[PDB]
Amino acid sequence: PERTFIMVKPDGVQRGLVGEVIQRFERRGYKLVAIKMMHASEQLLQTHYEALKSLSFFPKLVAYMSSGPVVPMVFEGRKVVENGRTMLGATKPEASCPGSIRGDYCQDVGRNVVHGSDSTESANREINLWFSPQELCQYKQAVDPWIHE
Amino acid sequence: PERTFIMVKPDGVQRGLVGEVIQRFERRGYKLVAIKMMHASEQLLQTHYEALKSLSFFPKLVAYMSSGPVVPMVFEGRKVVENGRTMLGATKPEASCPGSIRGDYCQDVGRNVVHGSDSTESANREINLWFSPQELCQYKQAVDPWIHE
Ligand SMILES: Nc1ncnc2c1ncn2[C@@H]1O[C@H](COP(=O)(O)OP(=O)(O)O)[C@@H](O)[C@H]1O
Ligand SMILES: Nc1ncnc2c1ncn2[C@@H]1O[C@H](COP(=O)(O)OP(=O)(O)O)[C@@H](O)[C@H]1O
């Protein structure tokens, strides 16, 4: 069961885009299995972005990502990691195509509304960092026979 | 700070309407301050519906509301309880007007997608039943000066 970690950033919350992000995944048949709103601590954010810890903008990113609530969530379905990346669009909004989240809503790489896992290994790490196993819900989608072979 | 308790029911999750419900409140300027997905236990559901415990359909409602995950959430803003009720529409979908959630999406009172508090006192009780105070996030909406006097 492929899963990906999606997270609305503080600017996505402020601009009222939480439902929009969820709905883009639901409309593609993906199964919401976990979600919550929280203030993320600096330590959690530093671990989440550990691959970037050596970059100049790391402290600014961490301080920004803790400056208002975020909405982490988990979606499940076929090719959800790769399709999640396409649906979010390029990291830099000016490189993203219309129809993607960042192409429709963003103008600045530093205010690009949403985070999504870039690989299966990253998804598994991020899911387990933000959610305990008991927060992940299991159910069978009624439309399952019509969304994949 | 007025708050209301909104909850997507198992049929709203199955039919991919979670983001739609959130977005109707965000588009009206209301502030999302708490959300999670969970399997609700029978005991929690019986307390939530305690006013109905003497009615014939009570056990069926409780069993149904525990048959798949739900998405409880909390919104904050001026007249959010009363406006929440109008936005959801009448309990019986056939009595609800188009433009409301149940008027747009529902055909059966027993599958009417979403729950919302019917009064301020009910909202405070339900919020505290489903969420500990630490799950409620506080922030200032940037659009605050433009959504109310
Ligand atoms: N040059 C930059 N200046 C400011 N913020 C940046 C810059 N590059 C990346 N960021 C922020 O840090 C995050 C790092 O994520 P990354 O894995 O590089 O790409 P993506 O967010 O598309 O997965 C970005 O989403 C963005 O918000
Ligand atoms: N006659 C009925 N048959 C089956 N289910 C019902 C019936 N009446 C109410 N319910 C269910 O129980 C819930 C009780 O909520 P109630 O406070 O009566 O109205 P509302 O849901 O509009 O606040 C309804 O939302 C509905 O899902």
Domain carrying residue A60:
1-149
Secondary-structure percent of chain B, ordered helix, strand, coil, rounded to 5: 45, 15, 40
Query: Which tokens in the block code for residue B110?
Result: 């027993």
Are B107 and B93 spatial neighbours (Cβ–Cβ below 8 Å)? yes
Interacting residues of A133 by C-beta distance below 8 A, sequence separation 6+: none
Task: Using alpha carbons only, give the angle B122, B125, B126 rounded to the nearest 5 degrees.
Answer: 85
Q: Which residue in A8, A37, A144 has the most chain B C-beta atoms within 10 A of its own C-beta, making it the best mutation to test that interface?
A: A37
Query: Which tokens in the block code for residue A33?
Result: 């299995």
Are B30 and B87 spatial neighbours (Cβ–Cβ below 8 Å)? no
Alpha carbons A149 and B116: distance in angstroms, whole number: 37
Give distance in angstroms: CA of A142 to centre of ligand 1. 37
Helix axes B18-27, B80-88, angle to 10 degrees: 130
Alpha carbons B23 and B28: distance in angstroms, whole number: 8
Indicate the SS3 state at residue B122: helix
Q: Which amino acid is at B82?
A: E
Alpha carbons A116 and A121: distance in angstroms, whole number: 12
Which chain A residues are within 8 Å of B137, Cβ to Cβ? 37-39, 69
- A83 within ligand 1 shell (Cβ under 6 A): no
* Closest ligand relative to B122 C-alpha: 2
* Mode of pairing for the β-strands spanning A31-35 and A71-76: antiparallel
Alpha carbons B36 and B70: distance in angstroms, whole number: 8
Tell me the technique behind this structure.
X-ray
Which among A23, A33, A142 is the nearest to B19, CB-wise? A23
Q: Which residue in A35, A65, A105, A111 has the most chain B C-beta atoms within 10 A of its own C-beta, making it the best mutation to test that interface?
A: A35
- Please list, residue by residue across A108-136, b when 16 or more beta carbons sit within 10 angstroms of its beta carbon and e when fewer do: eeebbbbbbbbeeeebebbbeebbeeebe
First to last CA, chain B: 14
Residue A3: closest CA among A23, A26, A31: A31
- A95 within ligand 1 shell (Cβ under 6 A): no
**Chain A / chain B CB contacts < 8 angstroms:** 85
**DSSP assigned state of B123:** H
Q: Which amino acid is at B144?
A: D
Q: Which amino acid is at A117?
A: S
Interacting residues of B120 by C-beta distance below 8 A, sequence separation 6+: B2, B81
Reduced 3-state DSSP string for A66-128? CCCCEEEEEEECCCHHHHHHHHHCCCCHHHCCCCCHHHHHCCECCECCEEECCCHHHHHHHHH
Query: Which tokens in the block code for residue B26?
Result: 């965000």
Query: Which tokens in the block code for residue B129?
Result: 């039943």
Indicate the SS3 state at residue A35: strand
Radius of gyration, alpha carbons of chain A: 15
Residue B20's alpha-carbon distances to A142, B13, B53, B73, B111, in angstroms, are 19, 11, 30, 13, 16
Interacting residues of A108 by C-beta distance below 8 A, sequence separation 6+: A93
Which chain A residues are within 8 Å of B135, Cβ to Cβ? 36-38
Query: Which tokens in the block code for residue B45?
Result: 């559901």
- A58 within ligand 1 shell (Cβ under 6 A): no
- How many domains does chain B contain in total? 1
List the resolution, Å.
2.1
Are B125 and B55 spatial neighbours (Cβ–Cβ below 8 Å)? no
Q: Please report, for the domain that includes residue B27, its CATH number.
A: 3.30.70.141
Alpha carbons A52 and A71: distance in angstroms, whole number: 21
Are A49 and A40 spatial neighbours (Cβ–Cβ below 8 Å)? no
What is the H or E stretch that residue B75 is in? strand B71-76
Residue B18: closest CA among B37, B31, B32, B5: B37
CB contact under 8 A, A14 and B141: yes
Are A97 and A89 spatial neighbours (Cβ–Cβ below 8 Å)? yes
